[model samples]
Target: YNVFPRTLKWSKMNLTYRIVNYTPDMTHSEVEKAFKKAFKVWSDVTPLNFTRLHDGIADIMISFGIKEHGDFYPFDGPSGLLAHAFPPGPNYGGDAHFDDDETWTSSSKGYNLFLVAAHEFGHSLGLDHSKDPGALMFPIYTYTGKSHFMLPDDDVQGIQSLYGPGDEDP
Candidate 1:
């Protein structure tokens, strides 16, 4: 596993994220729940904490887009680029955007939101793609079945290197 060059990371342990928009393919609650679980993937292994915001700006802003969005990095369509995220910083930093053209779902039938968002959040937290194919930070996406998802050791070490280990009580 690797981190963004210069190791860009959030200074604070507690961070907030807001879903600016949702994909029409899934219900609002489903999208929210997937994001919640995805964020938990990192928070569970590091001192970091994530809180969802209903209004106003957050440390991380998440949204779904197709082709050209507001940002310079636009989506291609169904499968080319599933999503992309910015490294931690001010302004557009730490923002994650998903491709709405793909079918996002909680199940394995379609691209799993929990899996993709977890990977995106890793970028949002300053983690770069890992060479380990089994690592969650790996660039390639795979369906590992979210029912019993586990954070690989590579991922734990990577995140811990950025924010330290999680609280024993948490």
Candidate 2:
């Protein structure tokens, strides 16, 4: 597991996220659910908590985009770059952008939204890619089925190191 240089992390345990827009490939409900579960992957193990906002700027802003979507790091069409996210901070920081050119899905057919968002949120929470293939923070994308997805031990320790262990009742 890896942490971002300078150890960037959210100062508050409770954070808010807003879905700025949705991709045409999946229904809005599906996209919303995918992200909710994605955030839960990290929140389940650490003191951090994520809340979704319907409007207004949030700690993390999420959306879908194509080749050139304002940011310097443009999406490379379909397969090359599925998504990207920023480390915790103000303005563009802690935001996530998904490549709308790809077929974002909720199942095994195409790139799974839950899986990719889970990885992206790792960056949003200040975690760098992990070397462990089994880890959720691994840079590469792999689908092990969303129904039984679990954050590997590498991810657990990595996130815990940032925000400490989650409450027993959380």
Candidate 3:
């Protein structure tokens, strides 16, 4: 059995995020909705809270980029490595980057931003990749439609281990 060593989690509950720029593949409203819902997935189940900002720095900085956009992990062109994020900490930590070369979609037609965002935020909040394939923190991307999206029990337990379960019913 593979065991994932838990990482550092945010000491506080109140956190802020900023969308530096949006992808042209989806409209601003579409991106906004997807991200908000993605963040909501965790917030609803944990004491963590997220606030959106239009400018300046934030606890979690979000944006889209293409090949060598300043970060060490330069995104490869479409169809591989959809996105990635940093673990919780100061500077470079809690930031998420999406490869612009991919067709980021609001639905199942392409890579759904909400699901990926939720997974990325899992990293941002200190959860590492899970050995359980069904987990949201799984290393590989498993696309599930928004209507049927559910945070896997493995992930729920992992996250709660770090931050304690919030409103989830037993």
Native-to-model Cα distance after best TM-score fit, residue 26 in candidate 3, in Å: 0.6
Residues 20-139, model 2: lDDT tens digits? 999999999999999999999999988888889999999999999999998999999878999999999998999999999999999988899998999999999999999998998998
- Sequence-dependent TM-score of model 3: 0.91
Q: Candidate 3 regions off by >4 Å?
A: 1-6, 168-170
lDDT of 2 at 94: 97
lDDT by residue for model 1 (1-170), tens: 96555679998999999999999989999999999999999998888889999989999999998999998998998888999999999878999999999999989977999899999999999899999999999988989655799989999888889888879566
lDDT (CA) for every model shown?
0.91, 0.92, 0.88
The collision pairs in model 2 are: none
Model 1 scores worst on lDDT over the 10 consecutive residues at 2-11
Candidate 3 — what's its lDDT? 0.88
lDDT of 3 by residue, 1-170 (tens): 97644559887899999999999999999999999999988887788889999999999999999989877899889888788899998888999999999889877877889888999999999888899978888898866545777888898888888888776673
lDDT top scorer: 2
My TM-score estimates for the predictions, one after another, are 0.93, 0.93, 0.91
| lDDT: worst 10-residue window of model 2 | 2-11
Q: In candidate 3, what residue range of length 10 has the lowest lDDT sum? A: 142-151
Instruction: Give per-candidate clash totals.
Output: 0, 0, 0
